Amino acid sequence: MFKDGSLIPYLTAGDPDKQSTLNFLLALDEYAGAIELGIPFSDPIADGKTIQESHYRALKNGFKLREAFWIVKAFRRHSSTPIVLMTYYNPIYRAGVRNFLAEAKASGVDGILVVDLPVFHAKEFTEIAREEGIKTVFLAAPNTPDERLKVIDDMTTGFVYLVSLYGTEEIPKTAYDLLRRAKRICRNKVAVGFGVSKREHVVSLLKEGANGVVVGSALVKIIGEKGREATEFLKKKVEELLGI
């Protein structure tokens, strides 16, 4: 969904508030190949310590599911950068799949990643996403076998998101191994969410085949501390990771 060599910012919707989220998105657009917007959830058990804390913040501050569409809709008036909504299944499930997807499309969302999409529901979910014009992004971790990477690649219409709940400050061998296996199996492009924090991480991963590098941990971190005023520091961070 993005150019090769893209830096893909990840931000939590409503952290610390929807206007702030929008401000951050607008300030980072110029460096983004695509953007991931996460919907905060009460139990983000698939996320690392940092991002989990942002879900908690957003929620304490009163985030409401559809405020995410408000953010996307506002952002769209200024940019056409591909947007992928990231969320747990519960919210989607309760509001109604097709209703959610249709609404997401209408707001300007291009793709979606359901972190814990139950395999039982996987098939119909991908079909509805196709009918609604929303591309699919599936997740894979170091413990995902080659066989499942294949199955994941076949259902994927957007791109395959590879993650590593390892951290570091250096990229773990286990994450590099995941990437290698992915490049050897996927026809879909892949992005890597290995919690990068250094200029060398970005270069190394792109050098190693990642079509795009996600950068969330590093950004959410600054947001946890700066709040609404993280904006300028976020730009400096991205420029650092980009060598500019």
Q: Which of 129, 57, 44 is nearest to 91 (CA)?
A: 44
Contact 178, 164 (CB under 8 A): yes
Distance, in Å, from the CA atom of 66 to the CA atom of 179, rounded to the nearest integer, reads: 34
For residue 7, the SS3 value is strand
* Alpha-carbon separation of residue 192 from 157, 166, 195, 212 (angstroms): 17, 13, 9, 7
Round to whole Å and give the CA distance between 92 and 101. 8
Instruction: Give the chain's end-to-end CA distance (angstroms, integer).
Output: 24
Contact 191, 1 (CB under 8 A): no
CA angle (120, 184, 191) in 5-degree steps: 70
Determine the Cα–Cα distance for residues 21 and 101; give it in Å rounded to an integer: 21
Taking CB atoms within 8 Å and a gap of at least 24, the contacts of 218-222 are 219/9, 219/10, 219/11, 219/24, 219/28, 220/10, 220/11, 220/12, 220/15, 220/50, 220/51, 220/53, 220/54, 221/50
Roughly what angle, to the nearest 10 degrees, separates helices 49-60 and 217-226? 40
Going by C-alpha positions, the residue among 40, 107, 110, 19 that lies closest to residue 69 is 107
Please, which experimental method was used?
Answer: X-ray
Name the strand (E) or helix (H) holding 100.
helix 97-107
Residues 25 and 129: their CA atoms lie apart, in Å, by 25
Looking up tokens 């917007």 gives: 37
Six-digit token string for 76: 């769209």
Tokens of 135: 């591309």
User: In the block, which residue shows the tokens 């929008």?
Assistant: 22
Q: Does domain 1-244 have CATH number 1.20.870.10?
A: no
CB 3 within 8 A of CB 49: no
Positions marked active-site: 36, 47
Which string of b and e fits 101-115 if b means at least 16 CB within 10 Å? Answer: bbbbeebbbbbbbbb
- 91: cis peptide before it, omega within 30°? no
Q: What is the DSSP letter of 39?
A: P
Q: Is residue 149 classed as helix, strand or coil in its secondary structure?
A: helix
Indicate the residue type of 124.
E
**Residue 209 structure tokens:** 């085949």
Query: 95: which 2 tokens?
Result: 């509001």
Which residues share a beta bridge with 212? 6, 191
Q: What's the CA dihedral at 224, 194, 39, 218 to 10 degrees?
A: 20
The domain ranges of the chain are 1-244
> Based on the number of CB atoms within 10 Å of its own CB, is 226 exposed (0-12), middle (13-18) or buried (19 or more)?
middle
The two structure tokens encoding residue 100: 């959610």
8-42: b (≥16 Cβ within 10 Å) or e: bbbbbbbbbbbebbbbbbebbeebbbbbbbbbbbe
Q: Give phi and psi for 185, each to the nearest 5.
A: -125, -35
120 Cβ contact partners less than 8 Å away, ≥ 6 residues apart: none
Structure resolution, Å: 2.4
Q: Which residues pair with 215 in a beta bridge?
A: 9
